[PDB]
């Protein structure tokens, strides 16, 4: 009842406009909502609970497939029920092929500790940040993302370096990073996207955030990230991606081409142009697809990793059956 | 003349024994002076006779030290000058157009040789005058070995700009250390590294500026040892590479047309004689010249301006004759 109306409000907020802007807020709200779902709805066996979770997660994902934090948090919860059921009652590999009613409290405590560990991902990333920045380095970022801004603005407490931020047109939110970071004395620079390659030779390394990392190591980021990665590969400069663990989602690029997110073309082309708006077709995607071959490293709350290892993290977070959801 | 033969013998002995003169510019000037004396203080009637004499002297000088090409380049330039003078005094390139369309010489040749010396004199300043347009403030420039042309280039550039220079010593002949002091005497904030570390530091280098010993026809280079590795690292990081090379260093030969392209010296520098027993089985090689393919070269800078490697064939065609690549 009350939980149902809260779920409906959450779905409507996702459909219209994200209230809690930070992805961490999305993860915390999704986990809390799943907590009241588990506590309130009645179930005898784990199967009906799993299918109810499948239905609710399907509804929430269908509300807005552009962002996948809700989806992979739901998948993590489903794996939590699977693990708890296997523990209280009793991974695909060649070894497997050759060889061969009180869990509610355990589920609740698992979700609680998941929230506790999710709280400190930013702090862990900041703690390990200092080992990848040396004095008088040149760093370039794209758009706005709180992870990398915390990264740099804490790693500059003991080091001095230069930072270049390219505005992510049309949503010129790189200016926000520039202002916030220059309010910490970092000697930053504000730049357009069209100049990326023009300056890319004189950059030591490039650190970027992301919105979602796929299974193959390819990621979905803000528009223009693919061009930056291509320039990096051309100049062979290392590329660092700062992404917490919950931004890892088990889908794959070729899925119905509902991958990008197209917004109103008002930002790209103002409505004041007039007559020419009929014969002209305008596209304003907000996300770009970066292949895994252009990525050098992954920094998460657990440490450093290579893209070629990303698949393993998939097996430790999501059961293969719950990919389709 | 007796003194002409004396000077020829002294020159060939100096070339074949060791170094001298110190700078390739001085060697080219001495070769041009010797050739001028040969042309003046000798008897000859037909242009063919003079060309045969010049060819014999050039063959002898090249056989004295094949690894040194400046003498051969000067001889071929003199031969081309003789050909042009005879052609435009008697009559009036090997192109498709030519395919489809079928007494006072000595003074003119001497005047042309004097013009060649005059433009040789100011080659270093001609190269260094355009340094300011290739360096920006707070740049990082990496250099290998020892080269007076690059030294003058960087000194001229540093007059009105500030940047950092990283020099890799060219082991075993660690002549880069001279850079290490010389640029330091100009206050350019230089750093010294062993030449085992190029790639390790290479990612932090904005541009690489190097000299060379010889430029081949296809656009390749004969440089100091390890320059091939530096060029490979530059190509890997796609950092632009600059070859400060005067005009007189364009040999019309080709890389694999011959051997002894590398020059081998005593292995004492690499491995000292004090090792003793292990030297009795160990084979040691100390090549002092390395081959740089033209693919890894981004730009050539000469006393006439900048050029791409793909255009080198034209310049080599504008200074020599195809029938003189055999000498």
XYZ file of C-alpha atoms in Angstrom, chain B residues 48-284:
237
model
C 84.928 14.514 -69.969
C 88.581 14.635 -68.921
C 87.806 16.800 -65.885
C 84.877 14.555 -64.964
C 87.101 11.466 -65.197
C 89.755 13.083 -62.992
C 87.129 14.119 -60.435
C 85.632 10.620 -60.553
C 88.993 8.973 -59.863
C 89.734 11.303 -56.947
C 86.236 10.769 -55.556
C 86.587 6.996 -55.833
C 89.880 7.160 -53.942
C 88.472 9.414 -51.214
C 85.329 7.294 -50.791
C 87.452 4.138 -50.611
C 89.501 5.852 -47.893
C 86.500 5.842 -45.520
C 83.178 4.595 -46.926
C 81.244 5.387 -43.736
C 81.966 9.104 -44.291
C 79.716 10.367 -47.093
C 80.285 14.145 -46.973
C 83.318 13.925 -49.277
C 81.330 11.869 -51.772
C 78.410 14.291 -51.588
C 80.713 17.243 -52.287
C 82.313 15.384 -55.207
C 78.892 14.596 -56.682
C 77.805 18.216 -56.208
C 80.912 19.380 -58.082
C 80.144 16.859 -60.834
C 76.580 18.174 -61.107
C 77.885 21.750 -61.273
C 80.259 20.746 -64.079
C 77.415 19.035 -65.944
C 75.111 22.052 -65.636
C 77.815 24.514 -66.692
C 78.780 22.446 -69.735
C 75.139 21.930 -70.697
C 74.220 25.607 -70.513
C 77.441 26.796 -72.170
C 77.339 24.263 -75.039
C 73.635 23.513 -75.486
C 70.882 24.910 -73.273
C 66.318 15.598 -65.214
C 64.802 12.224 -66.183
C 61.101 13.095 -66.245
C 58.132 11.893 -68.274
C 58.188 15.101 -70.330
C 61.764 14.383 -71.414
C 60.699 10.806 -72.172
C 57.898 11.972 -74.475
C 60.052 14.727 -76.042
C 63.260 12.727 -76.606
C 86.685 27.921 -73.240
C 85.614 29.962 -70.203
C 84.103 27.019 -68.299
C 86.748 26.924 -65.557
C 86.040 30.426 -64.233
C 82.307 29.688 -64.072
C 82.962 26.433 -62.202
C 85.217 28.261 -59.735
C 82.559 30.936 -59.195
C 79.926 28.253 -58.575
C 82.198 26.522 -56.053
C 82.771 29.855 -54.300
C 79.000 30.362 -54.117
C 78.728 26.868 -52.632
C 81.288 27.787 -49.962
C 79.488 31.078 -49.272
C 76.194 29.306 -48.628
C 78.034 26.659 -46.593
C 79.377 29.377 -44.292
C 75.987 30.530 -43.005
C 74.183 27.184 -42.933
C 74.160 26.904 -39.132
C 72.678 30.379 -38.676
C 70.164 29.728 -41.464
C 69.007 26.629 -39.584
C 68.983 28.345 -36.180
C 67.129 31.484 -37.317
C 63.819 29.575 -37.535
C 64.005 27.888 -34.120
C 61.536 30.311 -32.510
C 58.674 29.036 -34.698
C 59.050 25.404 -33.563
C 59.294 25.827 -29.762
C 56.582 26.953 -27.344
C 56.876 27.987 -23.711
C 57.274 25.235 -21.096
C 57.917 22.597 -23.748
C 59.839 19.357 -23.209
C 62.461 18.619 -25.874
C 64.449 15.379 -25.912
C 67.835 14.995 -27.596
C 70.275 12.145 -28.241
C 74.061 12.281 -28.435
C 76.121 15.283 -29.515
C 75.284 17.621 -32.383
C 76.449 21.205 -32.888
C 73.482 22.019 -35.146
C 70.940 21.024 -32.486
C 73.055 22.819 -29.876
C 72.904 26.103 -31.802
C 69.208 25.512 -32.535
C 68.359 25.119 -28.848
C 70.586 28.016 -27.771
C 68.890 30.332 -30.272
C 65.451 29.085 -29.212
C 66.147 29.554 -25.489
C 66.978 33.261 -25.892
C 63.308 34.308 -25.822
C 61.591 31.149 -24.532
C 61.717 28.861 -21.503
C 61.555 25.076 -21.810
C 63.049 21.845 -20.468
C 65.546 19.666 -22.346
C 66.230 15.993 -21.610
C 69.432 14.560 -23.105
C 70.139 10.833 -23.369
C 73.812 9.875 -23.299
C 74.893 7.943 -26.402
C 76.674 5.032 -24.760
C 79.439 4.069 -25.006
C 80.619 7.398 -26.479
C 78.775 9.408 -23.843
C 79.026 12.689 -25.750
C 75.553 13.792 -24.634
C 77.195 14.909 -21.385
C 78.632 17.845 -23.344
C 75.069 18.953 -24.018
C 74.558 18.402 -20.291
C 77.128 21.101 -19.573
C 76.757 23.253 -22.697
C 73.019 23.858 -22.402
C 73.593 24.236 -18.659
C 76.058 27.018 -19.452
C 73.160 28.746 -21.238
C 70.733 28.010 -18.389
C 68.132 25.851 -20.146
C 67.266 23.553 -17.193
C 68.424 20.285 -18.730
C 68.281 16.711 -17.434
C 70.637 13.796 -18.139
C 69.529 10.208 -18.653
C 71.123 6.955 -19.697
C 69.934 5.765 -23.113
C 68.336 2.647 -21.631
C 65.347 4.708 -20.436
C 63.990 6.557 -23.508
C 60.632 4.794 -23.744
C 60.227 4.946 -19.960
C 60.416 8.755 -20.057
C 59.179 9.071 -23.644
C 55.517 9.516 -22.669
C 56.363 12.846 -20.973
C 58.211 14.391 -23.951
C 56.382 16.918 -26.122
C 58.848 16.915 -29.030
C 62.129 15.291 -30.054
C 64.853 17.221 -31.894
C 67.858 15.286 -33.214
C 70.729 15.716 -35.630
C 72.001 13.180 -38.126
C 75.092 12.068 -40.031
C 73.640 11.180 -43.446
C 70.324 11.374 -45.305
C 69.631 8.728 -47.937
C 67.571 9.001 -51.120
C 64.341 7.459 -49.807
C 64.431 9.756 -46.768
C 66.111 7.419 -44.281
C 68.797 8.469 -41.813
C 72.212 7.386 -40.587
C 72.307 8.542 -36.971
C 74.125 7.707 -33.755
C 73.484 4.341 -32.131
C 70.105 4.001 -30.439
C 68.403 6.667 -32.561
C 66.288 3.935 -34.158
C 64.889 3.092 -30.719
C 64.136 6.763 -30.035
C 62.337 7.118 -33.372
C 60.376 3.929 -32.678
C 59.300 5.260 -29.278
C 58.295 8.557 -30.899
C 56.177 6.702 -33.455
C 54.628 4.649 -30.644
C 53.663 7.827 -28.773
C 53.065 9.777 -32.031
C 55.309 12.600 -30.817
C 56.554 14.784 -33.701
C 60.240 14.310 -34.490
C 62.565 16.952 -35.956
C 65.772 16.222 -37.876
C 67.990 19.309 -37.896
C 70.147 18.512 -40.916
C 72.093 20.810 -43.270
C 71.674 20.571 -47.024
C 75.087 19.032 -47.668
C 74.115 15.768 -45.843
C 71.967 14.216 -48.601
C 73.700 11.120 -49.942
C 71.954 9.872 -53.113
C 72.544 6.246 -52.096
C 69.996 3.751 -50.784
C 69.929 1.802 -47.488
C 70.214 -1.820 -48.623
C 72.143 -1.199 -51.854
C 75.357 -1.915 -49.924
C 76.747 -2.978 -46.549
C 79.278 -1.493 -44.098
C 76.582 1.144 -43.589
C 77.158 0.598 -39.886
C 80.632 1.572 -38.685
C 82.313 -0.806 -36.236
C 85.003 0.384 -33.822
C 87.168 -1.477 -31.321
C 85.014 -3.361 -28.768
C 87.182 -1.884 -26.017
C 84.658 0.900 -25.389
C 81.780 -1.551 -24.895
C 83.711 -4.204 -22.950
C 87.085 -3.228 -21.433
C 90.125 -5.402 -22.057
C 90.526 -6.079 -18.314
C 87.892 -8.854 -18.429
C 90.531 -11.362 -19.557
C 89.414 -14.966 -20.020
C 85.778 -14.358 -21.004
C 86.988 -12.209 -23.915
C 88.485 -15.339 -25.499
C 85.023 -16.717 -26.441
C 82.777 -13.642 -26.228
C 82.031 -11.837 -29.491
C 81.431 -8.099 -29.059
